[PDB]
Design a binder for these strands. Structure first.
Ligand code: MG
Ligand code: MG
Ligand code: MG
Ligand code: MG
Ligand code: MG
Ligand code: MG
Ligand code: MG
Ligand code: MG
Ligand code: MG
Ligand code: MG
Ligand code: MG
Ligand code: MG
Ligand code: MG
Ligand code: MG
Ligand code: MG
Ligand code: MG
Ligand code: MG
Ligand code: MG
Ligand code: MG
Ligand code: MG
Ligand code: MG
Ligand code: MG
Ligand code: MG
Ligand code: ZN
Ligand code: ZN
Lengths: 97, 91, 214, 201, 97, 127, 25
RNA sequence: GGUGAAAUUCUUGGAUUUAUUGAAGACUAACUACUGCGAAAGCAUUUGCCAAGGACGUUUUCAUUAAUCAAGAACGAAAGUUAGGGGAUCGAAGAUGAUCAGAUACCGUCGUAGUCUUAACCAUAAACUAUGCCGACUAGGGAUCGGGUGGUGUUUUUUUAAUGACCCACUCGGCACCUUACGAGAAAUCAAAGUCUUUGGGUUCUGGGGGGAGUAUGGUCGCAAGGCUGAAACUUAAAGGAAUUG
């Protein structure tokens, strides 16, 4: 799956969660992917997208909601965005996504 | 420590009106006071305030809804029916 | 003191292209009067002649064909495609006990955007030497064959209109490609396209119609 | 004193620089922030307003006009809606079924809003006490409570008087009756407990 | 006592099989206990075949049968059709003719 | 050679139909039934009547125009007794022998993917 | 009598005694 | 039209019939079988999704972790009950046509509830194989379902394979049938209902003459209907089972 992929990233890579701290990452061009929750409002979505293109960073439109995104990264809270910093053994960076 | 055996919130009416009605109110009452999931911001913070009006605590959006529940059986089936019909006109 | 026989205006039914006899039958109407006319009210009916009767050859006695009346021009009303059926007797004969049945279907749009559903029927077969008295495919078998029949039927439709599809079905080529891809799975026998229905037409367009004519 | 909530929707004035705000009945699911589209050439979503001609059959709409322009007459009560059940384009009539069961035909220009009207279900819950009705009609009109005419004296009402309470005559009154007389079941074409599926065909 | 190993008629590894309606009295009766008979017979009959081909067009034509499966209810199966009633031994025998 | 109409013979019990139509169906021609050519209710399907009716029908068929016709015999069906009635036999028999022509005849007895509960209830029409 | 019509006999029978006793709770 | 035969019934409102569309809700025909699967109720159109499962294969892992079970608990056909929706069909009630001595019926018409579905109930069926579960042993046969191993088998042709389906032998595990009688039984019959006066592998549950009676009473569960638990007094010589002859 994609979660299965994301799974690998968590238990072996480096990441950051949430709106403020993936912008730190986009500004420093440290991000490899940013993943975007379904119900995250368009403005935030549109803003990250701009940030991402300026930094040449691809953007996965996670089609679940921010409640379940947080569970996809295995946290008992909820995340509206993830930033991949390094894909540990995961091929998300060079698979379909 | 179980306070009542079956009246629940409906205990406020004591003995009056007849179980059968107390029962029916207790239904819609539970419906009508519950915190609901907000579609928009994902927190469960939708509460009622006057029938049809369902507004989200934190995040602040209000949604037209049923009189004691956010989404109504029909409302939903209608939703899907329109959606179906919509998609019929671009394919 | 009337006897509607002394009055009924009369008419003759012509067929379209890819067949034998375009001359087909005759019909009753009701004199073309100003207000309520022999024209626009009816005409557009539909006729059900066996295509064996419509293709000469008799290796065709089953397979029913529905011809709808689309246009008209004075003692001559053309007909086009509206669907095909099967003779009920042929069907209730392919369905013998002791063997697995398989049916399959799909809705689909041609070129000339006539939308339709075609059916497929097929049954398992014993093979010469098969001792066990019945022969049954194995469900996992059935889904396979069904799938393929579906991959094969979807292809053939959305070739240019029923026009080619008409042309396609009559030689029942589709039947063999079915059998072609199939025998890699499990035997089988009969294997036809059985039924086809019409349910969405585009606009009239006197043009394309009058291309099957002359 | 209305069942369903309203929805305040502001629009730009095509002719003057100014915001012009309208008052809608809120269809279920519509929301603050939501963008609402109104026009022939507009898109078939809950909340928008399209002319009954432009929506396929089985579309479900609210607050529909009887004549185009009358800014909405049919189906406005909480929970109600109408269904387009046909079109006749040479004449551009469109045929609807209204909440009552009745099926009218109106201009395919007559506008409606996609969805159902909100706060439905309101009447499934018992009023329980007289106070709750009390405040109910308090914000409607002085129609509550209701003395039975059969508890009145003759001066007061066809049903008044007698040494036990009783109507004394059939309470089915003709249409051709005259004011002072029409109390009871007016023009009643049948009467008694209704058995078996209602539902107009 | 028990007067048949098949009990009523022929279900041994199931529990429930849907019923069918008698082609006579319309009585419901489980499909396994049901008593069936293919009614394959021409569309014509006795002598009608001769005065067919004569007044028909086409040479010989074809001739088709009707094919309709018949389901009786025991009582109906007994009262008229296949049944007789067999001896205590002749009973056991499931070979048809 | 001919002119082709459609026969359509509905043969149920307690009555038999014969009536020819235009090959398209929309336009009929002539009818008459078994209940038309004898009087006693009980005898409304029986062959000797289905003859005398298929007789009259053969007439009009020629007393107008139709020389020929393919038949589509039919029974009650739906959720019922799927078997051909008594007097559809006599019909087919006494309409090839009349003076018309036969050719290509099937059955249109409606036979559902089964359903819609049969009448008579669980215990059947019992007597 | 049929076993079940007797089962139904005394179902009724009990409802009645069930009633007559309430009369006096 | 409906029937054994009728009648009530529908028909200038063109009925019944035909023909072209359309709606609604049910159902899954034929293929369907001494065939499959599930703890049992039960489950038969396609497709996707979702988690589940037996058998088999296994020179994998663990190592006595198991058998069976008062209490307690999950599911539990049909009808029935609560609140929505649905309400094509068939159709407890009721009203009718007829038949009858009568006819509250059987047959015919109308047709309420119901039938379907959601959310809750109810917990019962000849819920059956009228036959507890685990383990061992005792006897012949041909089919079949699933898995497997073998084979210079048959057929598919392309160029020969690979395959797939079929064929034959074996092996586990299924649903079953046949013939036997070592044996069993009051018999009917039974590969268990066998291996019991030559009476003991383990374990659960129920019965102790017939009625009275699943009645009374208490308890308990249920909205109700009812479910579970469940006596006595008194009466009585039989009631009952299989088989035989009539
Ligand atoms: Mg007042
Ligand atoms: Mg009052
Ligand atoms: Mg009052
Ligand atoms: Mg007074
Ligand atoms: Mg007065
Ligand atoms: Mg008066
Ligand atoms: Mg008075
Ligand atoms: Mg009074
Ligand atoms: Mg006996
Ligand atoms: Mg007996
Ligand atoms: Mg059972
Ligand atoms: Mg009898
Ligand atoms: Mg009292
Ligand atoms: Mg099917
Ligand atoms: Mg205890
Ligand atoms: Mg109903
Ligand atoms: Mg009655
Ligand atoms: Mg009477
Ligand atoms: Mg009665
Ligand atoms: Mg029991
Ligand atoms: Mg049984
Ligand atoms: Mg053996
Ligand atoms: Mg007693
Ligand atoms: Zn919110
Ligand atoms: Zn029967």
């Amino acid at each position: 799956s994609i979660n299965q992929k994301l799974a690998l990233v968590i238990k072996s890579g480096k990441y950051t969660l949430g709106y403020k701290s993936t912008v730190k990452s986009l500004r420093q061009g440290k991000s490899k992917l940013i993943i975007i929750a379904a119900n995250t409002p368009v403005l935030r979505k549109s803003e990250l997208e701009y940030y991402a293109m300026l930094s040449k960073t691809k953007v996965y439109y996670f089609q679940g909601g921010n409640n379940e995104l947080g569970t996809a990264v295995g946290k008992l809270f909820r995340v509206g965005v993830v930033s991949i910093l390094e894909a540990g053994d995961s091929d998300i960076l060079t698979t379909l996504a | 420590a179980k306070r009542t055996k079956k009246v629940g919130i409906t205990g406020k009416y004591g003995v009056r009106y007849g179980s059968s009605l107390r029962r029916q109110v207790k239904k819609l009452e539970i419906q009508q006071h519950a915190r609901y999931d907000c579609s928009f911001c994902g927190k469960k913070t939708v509460k009622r305030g006057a029938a049809g009006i369902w507004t989200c605590s934190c995040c602040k959006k209000t949604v037209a809804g049923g009189a004691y529940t956010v989404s109504t059986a029909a409302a939903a089936t209608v939703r899907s029916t329109i959606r179906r019909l919509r998609e019929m006109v671009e394919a | 003191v009337v006897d509607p026989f002394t009055r009924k205006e009369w008419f003759d039914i012509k067929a379209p292209s890819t067949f034998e006899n375009r001359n087909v039958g005759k019909t009753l109407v009701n004199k073309s009067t100003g207000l309520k006319s022999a024209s626009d009210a009816l005409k557009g009916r539909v006729v059900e002649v066996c295509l064996a009767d419509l293709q000469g050859s008799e290796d065709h006695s089953f397979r029913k064909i529905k011809l709808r009346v689309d246009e008209v021009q004075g003692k001559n009303l053309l007909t086009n495609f509206h669907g095909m059926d099967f003779t009920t007797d042929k069907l209730r004969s392919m369905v013998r006990k002791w063997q697995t049945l398989i049916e399959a279907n799909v809705t689909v749009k041609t070129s000339d955007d006539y939308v339709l559903r075609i059916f497929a029927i097929a049954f398992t077969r014993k093979q010469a030497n098969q001792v066990k008295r019945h022969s049954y495919a194995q469900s996992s078998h059935i889904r396979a064959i069904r799938k393929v029949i579906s991959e094969i039927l979807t292809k053939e439709v959305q070739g240019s209109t029923l026009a080619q599809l008409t042309s396609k079905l009559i030689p029942e080529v589709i039947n063999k490609e079915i059998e072609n891809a199939t025998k890699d799975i499990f035997p089988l026998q009969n294997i036809h396209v059985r039924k086809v229905k019409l349910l969405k037409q585009p606009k009239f367009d006197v043009g394309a119609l009058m291309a099957l004519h002359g | 004193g209305r069942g369903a909530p309203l929805a305040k929707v502001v629009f730009r004035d095509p002719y003057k620089y100014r915001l012009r705000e309208e008052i809608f009945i809120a269809n279920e699911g519509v929301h603050t922030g939501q963008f609402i589209y109104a026009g022939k050439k507009a898109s078939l979503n809950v909340g928008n307003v399209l002319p009954l001609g432009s929506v396929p059959e089985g579309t479900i709409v609210s607050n529909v006009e009887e004549k185009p322009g009358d800014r909405g007459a049919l189906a406005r009560a909480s929970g109600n809606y109408v269904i387009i059940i046909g079109h006749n384009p040479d004449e551009n009539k469109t045929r609807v079924r209204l909440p009552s069961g009745a099926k009218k035909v109106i201009s395919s220009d007559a506008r409606g809003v996609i969805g159902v009207i909100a706060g439905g279900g309101r009447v499934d819950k018992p009023l329980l006490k007289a106070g709750r009705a009390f405040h109910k009609y308090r914000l409607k009109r002085n129609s509550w409570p209701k003395t039975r005419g059969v508890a009145m004296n003759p001066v007061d009402h066809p049903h008044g008087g007698g040494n036990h309470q009783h109507i004394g005559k059939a309470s089915t009154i003709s249409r051709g009756a005259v004011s002072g007389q029409k109390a009871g079941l007016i023009a009643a074409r049948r009467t008694g407990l209704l058995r078996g599926s209602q539902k107009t065909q | 006592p028990k007067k048949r190993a098949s009990n009523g008629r022929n279900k041994k590894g199931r529990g429930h099989v849907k019923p069918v309606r008698c082609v006579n009295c319309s009585k419901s009766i489980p499909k396994d206990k049901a008593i069936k008979r293919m009614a394959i017979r021409n569309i014509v009959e006795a002598a009608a075949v001769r005065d067919l081909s004569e007044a028909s067009v086409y040479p010989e034509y074809a001739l088709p049968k009707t094919y309709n499966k018949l389901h009786y209810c025991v009582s109906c199966a007994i009262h008229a059709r296949i049944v007789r009633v067999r001896s205590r031994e002749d009973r056991k025998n499931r070979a048809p003719p | 050679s001919q002119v082709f109409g459609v026969a359509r013979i509905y043969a149920s019990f307690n009555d038999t139909f014969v009536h020819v139509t235009d090959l398209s169906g929309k336009e009929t021609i002539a009818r008459v039934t078994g209940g038309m050519k004898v009087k006693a209710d009980r005898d409304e399907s029986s062959p000797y009547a289905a003859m005398l009716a298929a007789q009259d029908v053969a007439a009009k068929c020629k007393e107008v125009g139709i020389t020929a016709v393919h038949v589509k015999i039919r029974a009650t069906g739906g959720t019922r007794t799927k078997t051909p009635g008594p007097g559809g036999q006599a019909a087919l028999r006494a309409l090839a022998r009349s003076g018309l022509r036969i050719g290509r005849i099937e059955d249109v007895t409606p036979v559902p993917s089964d359903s819609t509960r049969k009448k008579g209830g669980r215990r059947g029409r019992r007597l | 009598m049929r076993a079940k019509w007797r089962k139904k006999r005394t179902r009724r029978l009990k409802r009645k005694r069930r009633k007559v006793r309430a009369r006096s709770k």
